[PDB]
Write a protein that binds this ligand. Structure first.
Ligand SMILES: NS(=O)(=O)c1ccc(C(=O)NCc2ccc(F)cc2)cc1
Ligand SMILES: NS(=O)(=O)c1ccc(C(=O)NCc2ccc(F)cc2)cc1
Ligand SMILES: [Hg+2]
Ligand SMILES: [Zn+2]
Length: 258
């Protein structure tokens, strides 16, 4: 009746309404470190988030999104495997009901507690709607989260969750700095893929960072307290909102380091 991550409308049923689910460049995938190709022509990543304007945070029934003002080149992504300028529009996480699961991409079959997705679109296309009709329209920066010590920069996000507990709720969320969520190194793996939720459009250049960020048990616990349902509907905790690794098919994963 609408997709989800439940037994009856989860990832394994998505192909019925979204045929592209069995496509050739679907994400996420397992990153086999020994088979990825060191490509020395890949340039270093350029992250310019100093003029970033966050606006709102909302629970959309599948995850929570922090939205940004993308009317101008305030927060961009360039370099690496990219051609042109990509504007940050929003970021979200995927996580599990337990620490040994949660990420979408895996490294040598290893799953992390959660995964962060910073979503950007190609400025050459004018608006996001046009970008989703192109093979090089989007660029998502993936960052793994492992459980250990607390991440200061994440607490601001964790505190506001109580006000967006149920589907459809949103809270004002200004002056948040996304730079606080970055690992120390910007080394990455890259490959051509797709959105990991319906409509699953194959319009994404994936950039997965090698170095994960550390978050505390308490911080991750608060993500698990959110709800998939709207207010007044029976309660279903928001956990395990991640799609299983897909076949690599005819693709090659290139690394920016050896
Ligand atoms: N400029 S703003 O802060 O108000 C803004 C923020 C987020 C979004 C969004 O998440 N929708 C994405 C989206 C919508 C349609 C598509 F075809 C592709 C992506 C849209 C506008
Ligand atoms: N987990 S992920 O990074 O892959 C991801 C990023 C963005 C979106 C999205 O904007 N959906 C809206 C949307 C609606 C209609 C469209 F035609 C296109 C996008 C979905 C998944
Ligand atoms: Hg596309
Ligand atoms: Zn995502």
């Amino acid at each position: 009746h609408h997709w989800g991550y439940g037994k009856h409308n989860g990832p394994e049923h998505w192909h019925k309404d979204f045929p592209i689910a069995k496509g050739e460049r679907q994400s996420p995938v397992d990153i086999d470190t020994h088979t990825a190709k060191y490509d020395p022509s890949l340039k270093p990543l350029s992250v310019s988030y100093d003029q970033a304007t966050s606006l709102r945070i909302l629970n959309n029934g599948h995850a929570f999104n922090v939205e940004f003002d993308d009317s101008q080149d305030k927060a961009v992504l360039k370099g690496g495997p990219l051609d042109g300028t990509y504007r940050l529009i929003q970021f979200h996480f995927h996580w599990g009901s337990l620490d040994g699961q949660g990420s979408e991409h895996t490294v040598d079959k290893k799953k992390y507690a959660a995964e962060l997705h910073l979503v950007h679109w190609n400025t050459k296309y004018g608006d996001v709607g046009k970008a989703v009709q192109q093979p090089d329209g989007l660029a998502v920066l993936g960052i793994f989260l492992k459980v250990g010590s607390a991440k200061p920069g994440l607490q601001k996000v964790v505190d506001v969750l109580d006000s967006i507990k149920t589907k459809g709720k949103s809270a004002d969320f200004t002056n948040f700095d996304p730079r606080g969520l970055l690992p120390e190194s910007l080394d990455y793996w890259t490959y051509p893929g797709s959105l990991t939720t319906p409509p699953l459009l194959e319009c994404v250049t994936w950039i997965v960072l090698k170095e994960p960020i550390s978050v505390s048990s308490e911080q991750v616990l608060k993500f698990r307290k959110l709800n998939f349902n709207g207010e007044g509907e029976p309660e279903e905790l928001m956990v395990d909102n991640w799609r299983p690794a897909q076949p690599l098919k005819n693709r090659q994963i290139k690394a920016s380091f050896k």
